[model samples]
Target: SWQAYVDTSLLGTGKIDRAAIVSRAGDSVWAASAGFNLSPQEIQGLAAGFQDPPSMFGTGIILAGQKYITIRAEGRSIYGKLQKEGIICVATKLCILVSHYPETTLPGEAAKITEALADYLVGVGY
Candidate 1:
């Protein structure tokens, strides 16, 4: 199912170290990589981030119980930084694609993958 997507299309790609698929309703995680456990509030906050990017940026995005500084929170994408590592989130019609990467290595590639996945989901009516 969704775990398959997380395993292959995302985690298996090696561009992102941590990844998850969350319902845009802000209520549930479809799948996640080991050690990237997320919380109810964290997922809700991400849904709210898409609800209002500017407002969400005011408080920052939290993932796996850690707070990340917002670098960009607008439109369908929200990018954040935590020291040398960073978070990328992309919202589709029904779900959000998420990943955190060590910018020292992957940098922008992570966002491209997340965003592309999200767009594919949207295109397919997911």
Candidate 2:
């Protein structure tokens, strides 16, 4: 029955930074972050102590994951700097995503779970 809900990564594209299957009072929300240089604890600490800019844009949090309202701490010229470094941030030429997943989950563990879950769904495919 849940086979229709399955999601599989087509390939091992790269490393995953952070991820979470958030549930508030039993309501689950899937949120994941990739390409992080920081751990979840570090992210949380930053979120708690860092002062947001005057704009006070916003923040997002998934269960057991990092809070990606980062970038505010960076200066406006960061985009230019990244470009100068030949680092392309945009994918599909549309949006730019910052702040990677908190590195709380172990690589082997995360991979095992992610793979096992997909396998379970595939085996149960309708």
The number of the candidate with the highest lDDT is 1
lDDT of each: 0.86, 0.27
The best candidate by TM-score is 1
Write down the RMSD of candidate 1 (Cα, Å): 1.2
- Compute each candidate's TM-score over C-alphas: 0.93, 0.24
Error of 2 at 105 (Å): 1.4
Tens digits of lDDT, candidate 1, 35-107 = 8988998899889888789987789888998899998898799999888888899888888889888755465
* TM-score, predicted candidate 2 vs. hidden true structure: 0.24
How many steric clashes does model 2 contain?
1
- List the pairs of residues colliding in candidate 2: 18-101
